[PDB]
Structures are given as structure tokens and as C-alpha cells.
């Protein structure tokens, strides 16, 4: 029984060494000398092995991603099976096809991972029993089944999330035990030695929110590593946490690390000045600063010590990520005015404060900044913490973005975060023009929920024109059919072939409408002119062929 687990550990398995570690860790050394150590060393190798390839990107030996997602009686899906790619998966379809529901189900699945990492025996989010159940289904329960991949030793991590409507005879339940096991391995090896936890994030529609800038949310917690999991699957990027963390980094960079720690010891010396002035009478500030020293001792020791890298390097890395992914903003830095601490960026050469940034350049910075924050806080043992593993669920990456800026958004995101499995659900063809054919899942525009598969489009979308992607993949005309001014070339050809290619009474006046509408330099009039010449000299060929024949 022990021998089978040791043979499985020799053959390669993360879970097989875990119960061995749990059964030999509770006794004394001598009986545990090198016994616990070899399984700890092998487990930490299986988490932390990685190599630098020929392109310079750190690639882990045991990548973590989601393989398959199965939705049974979930919202509008009868029984839907989706196979997800390793690096990027795009789900496209009309308004009404459940492509936000897919991200919602994956986020509900990842909530168990996040909660069980954060607290031992924790509980993640659960499916609702009012809206997520299919109102047409007669089984009155819905289950969401996912499979996770964590290397060759861990081929499958199953998880099911079940929910039954009220009134059922049998209470259907979840089977989140393998997610519990994997997050237990990560948490109990992280509590004793530092590792690189993965990033789980969901960027839903509710990132499109105004900035308040008067935000005095609870000061003190926004520098601890497990704060990076705080409301990370909520749907909205925690730009509040990012800007509080960035003011923390600016103050610590300009004061705490340039000329050592000073802002605490100056008021320590103030207390040593005022401690023997007679009657003391200062008990309100006698103790509220004394634990600030304890805070800076037991929280900054991780960030300065060998587990978490240098804070100035953290600032440089998050600034580099922001100016690399975010299109026109090229630098981000903080001003300290009398009574205020405000962050300003260089947008198109103009120093613009965050609150008056544009709504299409601020809700993408709210994504990139928060994502880069969570990677640099959760993956500190890397030269580039943006190369850490994780799963990120972006909903409508093309939100509030110009078509000029949609041509590089997913290229910039995949360049900055190579090891993140992005799962995006876009509407625009221009985003699809930068994404491979195999990375696209699609919904046909007749999709009442019965499909057991989502398949890629037939034509390649990586270099195709936007009109071709719109008119072959998304099933939309290039010129609108609800406009009588768009069918004028077709009516021109009908009225011109009615009278054998002569501009007699109808084709000439309709040509005048085309010329007066589209313009002299218009490509539509260019086709019209070319077809006029080609079809006026066609009667010459008709006469020549008639003379040859008879």
C-alpha cells in the first residue's frame, strides 16, 4: 500500500507523494530523516521546474490549464462540451448565445480553487437555483463539469458543480474533492516554503465603472500576497487595490528604500522627544504607532527577503507591463501634493490624471494593471513574474476600444503574459483577425441549445481581411441590406442586362444617382464604369461571333 504509492511517486505523480507526506510528516525525525525531505523536494520540483527556451520566455515543465468544460442543463445549454486550447480560446456568437454563461461557469469552478487556496477547508461560490437552472429542462438540476491539466503526473483534475431547483426528491451535490486536494497541496507547501501560485482572474462587463479617486478603503492589508486573491473572480478589476498598492510602492521607493527607512523612525524620535516632557497625556498616539513598527517588521520582511523580490523591481515590472500592453499610455508615475497623492500617466504626450482618462483607455488599464499586480505579487521567484501560470477569463476584450487599437490588444496581452491561458469572448472581426482558426469557438445563428460541441470556423482568420472575417465567420453582409442605396449596383446590372448593355433610359439615370451619391472617386462608381465598358463592348463580340457562325 505504501509500496504502490512509492512506485507511483517514482513513476511521476504529484498526488501520490501527498498522502505519503501527510502520513510521515506527523512523526519525529530519525524516522522522518530524509523521508519527508525527499517527498518535499520532489513535490517542490514538480511545482517549480521550468526552462528558458530559444525565445527567452520562462516555460514551466508542468503547465496548468483547463482542458474540457461540460454544461448539462445549465441556463440555455442542454448538454454542451467545449474543448479549450492551451494558450488562447475565443468564443464568438450572437447576443443570446450563452458565451458569457461559459465564463460564468468557469469562474464558479475557479472560485473553489481560490477559496481552498486561501483557507483550508474553504468553500467557493455556488450555482444559483433561480436563474442558472434551465427553465425548459425537466430534470430540475444543472451540473457544470470541468477537467484541469497539471502536467504529465496529473492528467485529469475533475470537478463538478451541481445545483438542483427547490422541490426535487434528490439533492444533487458537487464533487470538488480533486480541486480540494490540489489546492491543499499548493497551500500546505506554500505555508512552509515559498512557491509561485497561479493567477485566477475574471474580467466581466462590470469593469466598466467610473473612478472615484477619493477611495479610503481599508488601509494596511494591500501589501500581503493573499490579498491578491481578494475578489479576483468578482468580475471587475480591483483598480482600487492597484492604485493603493501603487501609492504604497511610490512612498516606499522614494522614502523607505532610497535613504533607508525614515518616516517611521522620525516619529519614533518624536515620541522619544515627547516621552519625558512632564505629564504624558499622549496615550492615543503612544500605541497606534508602536504597532506600525510591528507591521513594517512582519509584513515588509517577506517583500525585502529572499521569498519576494525587490520592491523597486516590482514597480519597474508593473510600469513596464502597463506601458507595454496599454496602447497610448507610455509612462505612469505618482505625484505627492500637499494633502494629496495622485497617479498620472503620459497619454499621447500629455500628462493626464487617471480620473480624467478616457473610458476606453482606463478600463483596459484597470485590466492590465490589476493582472500585472496579481502576477508580481503571486509569482515572486521569477525573473519575469508575468511568465507565471494561471487562468484569466476576459469578457469582451474589445470593450470601448477603437478598431485601430483592436488590431494589437490580444497580441500585446499574449506577448506580456505568455503562460496565461486567456479565455476571451469577443464580438469584433478585427480581434479575430489577430487570432488563429484553432483558437476560436463559434455559435451558428440557429443555435437553440442542443449542440454537444463548439467548433472552429472553416476559413483561417489569422491574416484574412476584416470584410472576409465578418462575412464568412460572423455571417454579416459587408454592405447593409436594409439600405436601398446599397443594392444600386445590382439594380444597375439588372436594368443594364434588360436592354442588352445599353444606357438608354433607366441605366443612365440610375448611373446618375450612383455618381451623385457615392462620388466621383468612389470605388462603387469604379466598378460601375468598368462594367459599363465591359458590357458595352460585349455586343461587339456578339456581332463578331454571329458573323463567324453564320
Amino acid at each position: 500500500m505504501t509500496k504502490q504509492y512509492e512506485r507511483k511517486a517514482k513513476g511521476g505523480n504529484l498526488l501520490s507523494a501527498f498522502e505519503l507526506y501527510q502520513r510521515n510528516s506527523d512523526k519525529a525525525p530519525g524516522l522522518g530523516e530524509m523521508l519527508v525531505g525527499e517527498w518535499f523536494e520532489m513535490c517542490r520540483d514538480y511545482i517549480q521546474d521550468g526552462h528558458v527556451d530559444e525565445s527567452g520566455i520562462f516555460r514551466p515543465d508542468n503547465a496548468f490549464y483547463l482542458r474540457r468544460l461540460t454544461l448539462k442543463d445549465f441556463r440555455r445549454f442542454s448538454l454542451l462540451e467545449i474543448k479549450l486550447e492551451e494558450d488562447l480560446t475565443v468564443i464568438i456568437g450572437n447576443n443570446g448565445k450563452g458565451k458569457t454563461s461559459i465564463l460564468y461557469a468557469i469562474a464558479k469552478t475557479l472560485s473553489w480553487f481560490v477559496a481552498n487556496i486561501l483557507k483550508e477547508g474553504g468553500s467557493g461560490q455556488r450555482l444559483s437555483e433561480m436563474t442558472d437552472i434551465k427553465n425548459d429542462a425537466e430534470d430540475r438540476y444543472s451540473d457544470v463539469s470541468s477537467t484541469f491539466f497539471f502536467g504529465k503526473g496529473l492528467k485529469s483534475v475533475p470537478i463538478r458543480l451541481s445545483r438542483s431547483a427547490l422541490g426535487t426528491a434528490e439533492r444533487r451535490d458537487s464533487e470538488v474533492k480533486p480541486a480540494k486536494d490540489l489546492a491543499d497541496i499548493w497551500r500546505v507547501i506554500n505555508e512552509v516554503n515559498t512557491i509561485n501560485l497561479p493567477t485566477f482572474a475574471l474580467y466581466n462587463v462590470e469593469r466598466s465603472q467610473p473612478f472615484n479617486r477619493n477611495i479610503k478603503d481599508n488601509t494596511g492589508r494591500r501589501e500581503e500576497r493573499f490579498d491578491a486573491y481578494s475578489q479576483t473572480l468578482g468580475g471587475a478589476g480591483r483598480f482600487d487595490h492597484f492604485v493603493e498598492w501603487y501609492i504604497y510602492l511610490h512612498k516606499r521607493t522614494v522614502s523607505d528604500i532610497s535613504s533607508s527607512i525614515k518616516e517611521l523612525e522620525q516619529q519614533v524620535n518624536d515620541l522619544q522627544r515627547t516621552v519625558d516632557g512632564g505629564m504624558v497625556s499622549v496615550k492615543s498616539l503612544l500605541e497606534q504607532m508602536k504597532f506600525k513598527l510591528s507591521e513594517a517588521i512582519e509584513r515588509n520582511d517577506a517583500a525585502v527577503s529572499s521569498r519576494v523580490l525587490t520592491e523597486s523591481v516590482q514597480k519597474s515590472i508593473v510600469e513596464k507591463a502597463i506601458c507595454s500592453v496599454v496602447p497610448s499610455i507610455s509612462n505612469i508615475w505618482v505625484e505627492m501634493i500637499t494633502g494629496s497623492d495622485l497617479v498620472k500617466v503620459t497619454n499621447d504626450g500629455h500628462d493626464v490624471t487617471i480620473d480624467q482618462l478616457s473610458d476606453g483607455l482606463r478600463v483596459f488599464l484597470s485590466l492590465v494593471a490589476d493582472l500585472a499586480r496579481r502576477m508580481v505579487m503571486l509569482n515572486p521567484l521569477l525573473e519575469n513574474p508575468l511568465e507565471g501560470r494561471g487562468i484569466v477569463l476576459i469578457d469582451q476584450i474589445e470593450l470601448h476600444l477603437h478598431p485601430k487599437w483592436q488590431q494589437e490588444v490580444i497580441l500585446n496581452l499574449r506577448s506580456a503574459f505568455p503562460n496565461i491561458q486567456f479565455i476571451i469572448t469577443t464580438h469584433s472581426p478585427i480581434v479575430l483577425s489577430t487570432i488563429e482558426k484553432r483558437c476560436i469557438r463559434e455559435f451558428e445563428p440557429n443555435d437553440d441549445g442542443d449542440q454537444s460541441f463548439l467548433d472552429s470556423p472553416d476559413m483561417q482568420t489569422k491574416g484574412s481581411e476584416n470584410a472576409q472575417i465578418l462575412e464568412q465567420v460572423m455571417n454579416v453582409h459587408s454592405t447593409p441590406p436594409g439600405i436601398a442605396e446599397s443594392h444600386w449596383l445590382g439594380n444597375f446590372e439588372l436594368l443594364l442586362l434588360d436592354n442588352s448593355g445599353e444606357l438608354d433610359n433607366h441605366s443612365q439615370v440610375l448611373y446618375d444617382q450612383i455618381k451623385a451619391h457615392f462620388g466621383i472617386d468612389s470605388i462603387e462608381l469604379k466598378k460601375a464604369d468598368s462594367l459599363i465598358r465591359i458590357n458595352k463592348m460585349k455586343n461587339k463580340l456578339n456581332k463578331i461571333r454571329a458573323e463567324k457562325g453564320k
Binding site: 454537444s452 472576409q468 455571417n475 453582409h477 446590372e493 442586362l497 463592348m537
Partner: protein, 211 residues
């Protein structure tokens, strides 16, 4: 669409007789090399490349049960029935969408010529042919209405860009009519009639090239 040369009845379907068994009993692989020789591996309804394909019955099996095993009813279909819903053109659309239609209200590419009843324009849109009135005009409307040529986006846009991709070719080849002589300039059009059959769209480019 195209004249399909109905060459010879295969000997696979001679043993099985309609009424005793349905269409599902025969294996589907013994008729496709017989059909692809005369079709070129093409749906002859959307005039249409077969990346995925199945066998389509020109007249429906449920209405005329003793017509399926005649071999005059078998053609190729743009797409396959295994899509959980299928496409909206060629063979699937007649059996799934559209509505009521008559057997004599349809054009059959085996003997009837589609050149003088329907007309492929340069914009990818099909119209009825000029001078056509009455029952044949109603037939020319009805075939397009049940086969969705004026219709689904992936067919209409692809036909439009295939015809529009050769417009400079047609323009510059036609503008040298006075420069070149009779036989060596009609040699260009026989070169086109030897060119176009290795493409998806044949009669649309025929209508774009000559008339």
C-alpha cells in the same frame, strides 16, 4: 448551375428495392465515386465545393417513397447532416427550412439547362433571366427561394468575392480585342473554358467571362 452528364447507373442500388427497406440500410461509400466523376466533387445546388458532403434527394423520400432507388434522385449536398442543425443551403435547406414546393416547380440539372432561366450577375446576386415570363419564371424564383442562393452569407459573399476577384482579369483581357486577331483571341476564351473547372465557382465565372 451546370449540365451534369448522367453517365451510367451504378450496380450497387440494383439489388436493394424501395418499400422493403429504407435509405439507411445501404452503405454510403459505394455511390460517391460514381457521383464525383460527373459532379467534380461539387454540390450542384450552390455550385459549390464539397469540403464536407452528403447525399441529397432531389425529390423528398417521405412524400414519394418509391422514388429513392432510381439513381435519378441522388446528388451531392453542400455540407453534411452531422452538424446538429446543418447549413442553410443546397440540400439541407430544402429538407429543413423554406416551405411547401412542387416537384415540377424545381429545375433539375440532369437535362434542363440553367443558363437561360437564371443569371449570375457580377455582384454575386442571382436574378431570373431576361425575357422570362410565366411558369418558368415562377420556377426560376422558386428554385432560388428554396436553395438560398439569394440567401446565406457564406455562399453569397464567397461567390461575390470570387467573381469580383477576376474583374481586372476580364477587363484587361477584353480591352485587347482590337489588338489581337480572331483565332488567337478566341483561344483566350477556350483557355478560360479549360481554366475555370479547377475552381469552386464555374457558371458564375462563365457569366462573368462570356454571355
Amino acid at each position: 448551375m451546370r449540365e451534369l452528364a448522367r453517365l451510367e447507373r451504378p450496380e450497387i442500388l440494383d439489388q436493394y428495392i424501395a418499400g422493403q427497406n429504407d435509405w439507411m440500410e445501404i452503405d454510403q461509400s459505394a455511390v460517391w465515386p460514381k457521383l464525383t466523376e460527373m459532379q467534380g466533387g461539387f454540390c450542384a445546388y450552390c455550385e459549390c465545393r464539397l469540403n464536407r458532403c452528403h447525399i441529397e434527394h432531389f425529390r423528398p423520400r417521405g412524400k414519394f417513397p418509391a422514388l429513392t432507388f432510381i439513381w435519378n434522385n441522388l446528388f451531392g449536398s453542400c455540407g453534411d447532416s452531422r452538424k446538429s442543425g446543418g447549413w442553410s443551403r443546397c440540400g439541407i435547406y430544402k429538407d429543413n427550412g423554406a416551405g411547401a414546393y412542387n416537384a415540377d416547380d424545381l429545375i433539375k440539372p440532369d437535362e434542363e439547362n440553367p443558363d437561360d432561366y437564371l443569371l449570375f450577375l457580377t455582384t454575386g446576386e442571382v436574378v431570373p433571366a431576361i425575357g422570362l415570363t410565366g411558369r418558368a419564371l415562377k420556377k426560376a424564383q422558386e428554385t432560388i427561394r428554396v436553395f438560398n442562393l439569394n440567401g446565406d452569407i457564406k455562399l453569397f459573399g464567397s461567390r461575390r468575392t470570387a467573381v469580383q476577384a477576376i474583374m481586372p482579369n476580364v477587363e484587361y483581357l477584353y480591352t485587347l480585342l482590337e489588338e489581337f486577331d480572331e483565332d488567337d483571341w478566341n483561344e483566350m476564351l477556350r483557355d478560360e473554358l479549360e481554366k475555370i473547372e479547377s475552381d469552386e465557382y464555374k457558371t458564375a465565372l462563365k457569366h462573368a467571362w462570356t454571355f
